[PDB]
Design a protein around this ligand. Sequence first.
Ligand code: WRD
Length: 165
Amino acid sequence: SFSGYLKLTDNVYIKNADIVEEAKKVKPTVVVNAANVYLKHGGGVAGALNKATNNAMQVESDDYIATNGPLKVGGSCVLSGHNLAKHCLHVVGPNVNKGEDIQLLKSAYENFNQHEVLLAPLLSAGIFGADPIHSLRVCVDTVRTNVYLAVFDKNLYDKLVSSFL
Ligand SMILES: N[C@@H]1CCCc2c(O)cccc21
């Protein structure tokens, strides 16, 4: 199971880890991807997860988009987890660098409540431009299921833990 996590609340855990390496190790039922509405996994967490699947995630995603159209900001879809997990929950947090509504971050985290346990990154953090301290706060105040957060950056992980209220 998940090891080396710091417990933040009854259901939220956090670790300084590369979510790709964490997924390859744990092979959780659900790994969350920091997706965009087009499921174009170019960079950040999405680029890294997709590269770990040898682009199989992108091939599956393009078929999903061809059939269903784009996701909504704040929405999600469940696809295969490939070699990383049973499933990948592609969740679209608002991208403040694209001028999207930060208020949709709570709606994005609500998708996690449909899964009893998840390995996840902080939504809208990194290249999505939101404040990761705010993302962690929204996560702990929204998600009720068991979420294991992987924070790639050690300095950000330390800042998140040391400032956690
Ligand atoms: N590797 C096991 C397979 C069974 C499901 C599961 C999970 O939900 C979370 C963490 C690890 C695992």
